Subunit: 310 residues, 4 copies
Amino acid sequence: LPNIVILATGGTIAGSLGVDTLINAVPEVKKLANVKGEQFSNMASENMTGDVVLKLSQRVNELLARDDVDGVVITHGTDTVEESAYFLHLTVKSDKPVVFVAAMRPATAISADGPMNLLEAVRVAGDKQSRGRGVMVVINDRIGSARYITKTNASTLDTFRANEEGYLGVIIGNRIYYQNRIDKLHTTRSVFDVRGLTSLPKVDILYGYQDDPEYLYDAAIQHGVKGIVYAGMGAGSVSVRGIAGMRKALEKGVVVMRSTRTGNGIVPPDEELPGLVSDSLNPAHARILLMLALTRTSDPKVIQEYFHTY
Amino acid sequence: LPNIVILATGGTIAGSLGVDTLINAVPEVKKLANVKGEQFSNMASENMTGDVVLKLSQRVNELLARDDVDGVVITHGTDTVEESAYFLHLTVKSDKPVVFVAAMRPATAISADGPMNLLEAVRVAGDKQSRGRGVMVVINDRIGSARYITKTNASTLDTFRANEEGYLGVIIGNRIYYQNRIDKLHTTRSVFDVRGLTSLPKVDILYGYQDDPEYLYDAAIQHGVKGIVYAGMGAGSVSVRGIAGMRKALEKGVVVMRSTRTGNGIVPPDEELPGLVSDSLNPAHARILLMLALTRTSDPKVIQEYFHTY
Amino acid sequence: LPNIVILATGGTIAGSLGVDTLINAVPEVKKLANVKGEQFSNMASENMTGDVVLKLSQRVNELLARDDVDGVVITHGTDTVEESAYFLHLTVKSDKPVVFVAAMRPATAISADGPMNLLEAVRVAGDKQSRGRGVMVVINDRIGSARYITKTNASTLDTFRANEEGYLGVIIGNRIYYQNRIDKLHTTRSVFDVRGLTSLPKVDILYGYQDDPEYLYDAAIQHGVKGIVYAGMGAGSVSVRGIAGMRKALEKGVVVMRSTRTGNGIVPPDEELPGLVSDSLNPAHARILLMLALTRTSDPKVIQEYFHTY
Amino acid sequence: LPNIVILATGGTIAGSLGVDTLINAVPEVKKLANVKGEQFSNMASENMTGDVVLKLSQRVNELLARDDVDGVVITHGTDTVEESAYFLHLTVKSDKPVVFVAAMRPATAISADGPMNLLEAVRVAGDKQSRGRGVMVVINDRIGSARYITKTNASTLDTFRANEEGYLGVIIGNRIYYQNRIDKLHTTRSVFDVRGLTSLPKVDILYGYQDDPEYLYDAAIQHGVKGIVYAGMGAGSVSVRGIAGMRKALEKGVVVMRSTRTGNGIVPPDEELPGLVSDSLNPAHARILLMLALTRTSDPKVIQEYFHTY
């Protein structure tokens, strides 16, 4: 049996202490692997901070470096699991399976989804075929790449999707079907190393819409953000106001990253406009990447290249 | 043949002034109806402003009250057309068709989509079956409701979609197939009358995400916003910093609307959280409804109901 | 509280007879209404037959004509529920809610979806706002119209979808949100009355695909089918072999309905091809409408209109 | 510049002789590569036969074996392009790009899509990064794997999709963005060799629905089909009739493959039922694979393994 450690970052996703009420809630899990529960942190994912995500990443790198650990499963709130997951997707230097699992319904609710999600997560974490596939998010019978997956619906069980990238694999009838391998850098082939890191750069996200305010750029600049991700209109389009706001930020050495608020797609290069473009990274993902990029360089050209390859 | 007035708000979406380059680029349109072209404004949809959308709404109410006008087609940029169309969805007091048409590829590009989207738009605007359906957005053989449709992809022609609500109808083989009638208030049954208004209450949208800063709330507040739409994590989840920013906003007379960044779904009521909830209006749609709501009242009970019924 | 009759057609979708295991498995249901359980039939939906669906339709018309019955919930297998539900969509002459509920995971499975789907189904059936919406299929927090909904995936819980038409509504946080009203004929406004019928005209579905054989047409014909629904390539495209098979069918009194295997969309009229076109009814829905149509007439002009209006 | 040969299998997809009217319709193509037009065959894809697909596969293998050919582009009707493409996906022993391209609108129609599709196809065919990605189908800015892509809508421009597998890459702003590499065997790592093959086994497809006829199995058996692909209900579910029909076929040495009519998903193994299961192959794909499998063996276990790895 695989040795899999399950790290909890909040309350239980299955069962009625903490990561243990969970490990007991689903017995069948002990047939897939010899599990070990660890309550790494404990809060609503909307309260998950880069500092904790950074600790989580270091903890997991540490665990995976040992031979008595075959893979890691992380229970996490669904709201920002995509942010936390993409962070480790870029900072865990191991081919060992790293699976984030979440639930849309409380563990006490009727037809709660946590129990089946955990089981699937553990199955995927211990399966030999799961190696070297980057960080994954398992829920609702699907396996999504941390780089593509995102919560697309506020409240439905099937919320996680990668509309244009699809899923890596699915788990049907207790069998894992692997469909794709993502064509991007990650985990073992990533330049973002978190060994010795203590904090991350400040990157805020500004929305683009009709009449968007130029003053929020100022506020961001005045609070010393090292980077600004712009959840732009359409393909990162910027209004005159947003442009004056970006030009201003670019003078102060702030890195401007143009993404989209649409939800999917490529924000293509465009020299007529300020900042860099996010490729197919959505705002939440673009922010995690922009931060890690800055722990390496401030060179606009190198960062752009990261965004086209990570 | 129907009398359709084509209103342009930017450059031409068909052909190589402006609204006439457009009307002559697709002669086939003169077969579906008698068209008159009016260049209402001229700028990229990312620079379209509430003040102008306001004038558009009045210009459209004015045209539709005329016996020699059976419907209106409005060419608009794809980036914010959902904002503008929804604005008119709530303010045009007529059952005559109001069809916004856009184009994802430049008029002079290879396989430009504008010619066809315009033809379908005119056909929809002139069809007698199109009456009383609310404002529509026509593009890529589909007819979406202004209340549900949104640009889901940055650069694809099939970008417009209402994942959970579908399309009101479609146009295949030069024929309109009507599938749905939205079960919401709009146009002739809407209480929002902006006849005479010059400016609308200021509403900003703040993003929800790990480490989101309280200071962005302080900034919007200090600049006099009257309402803040929150593109929250998951179902309008708020961090301790966003909650503090929301309470500060409430203590300063700013109305708070909790939406979601996910892109789809329902943000449910939560007695344990501050502010109102957006039902299924995404951030961009929510901002439009809240602005209009604030010209009428600041009563949270009343505004909440608007968001459950419009 | 509403009076809801739960009709079972197979085993229980909730709990560990049959319809009572079900009603006692989800006590919360007794809170939404007063339920009476009736085991109508008992077999897997892949073995559900037109003759039984016919009896179900009459049993449902019978119950709904009673003042002590406010609505009906019908448990059914997921495999052919779209066929059965659409049958009742066209034959139940009542505005009272008729909600089919299914479950993708066995009742005793980990994270079984039946308990919740049943609760939502009962809530939808009993809500006063649910009247006059046509037959509904409730599962996975969604309410799809019997006319558009279809099982799009073999094994996932989110299998039910109407890609182009969306859901009539959804159930989030124990609340129903109604998004659409289908713009089609059904129930109280349907001409299809099957009161008293025992058997329906025989209709087969033949697939369209490279090298498809003419002999399958000969076979259906020789066995006395009255109608052939063609799950064609693309927009009901036919090969020279399928055309020959269709002409043979026409020369033998079999009505030909051209649909599509793609899974979505409109099959448009084509004067240059044989047979009728299915509008946007998929093969399985088309078969149901054609059978019912044939109990009324064989007039192609009339049947074509049914397919554009039901 | 890459040397790319464009093989036409029908009329032109762009422009107003044959593959030449097409090569002239889009000049920009000559900037991406030194192209050579060849009219391989000439008919409506719904009339495409395995014999021709087999010739096409041999022709392309022959072309790719030369150094003066860098990649191949095949214009094809949209109705069965997925069948033809999957065939070469399994029989072209080269890492050289093989791109199938199609158009949904006639080349003379307004906003015809062929011109942009061709250009994108050629770009993808000549780009060095496109090597070893299996056969691809380019249309509507998307790059889909022949193994996953399918026509999901009868008439819309965005019809091609792999709902659960997503696209391999997309082409936005004249730049190719590669997202996934499929995790299946194909082209250079495929055991299906067509060198010397003259014909393919007979495989027909039978639909599964309420009241499905057992006689079509007999008809298929009596016409000597070597294989039967079953577009089953839900997850390849079989009614009593279909089971008697399969048992009958299994006695006569016919290979029974259970797929689904739903459109997506896994048909899982199930020993309680007859035949083999198609994994995530849809009927059209399962038929192409079943035929090629039979040109190698009739062993039920080896064929099943093919279906879980190809």
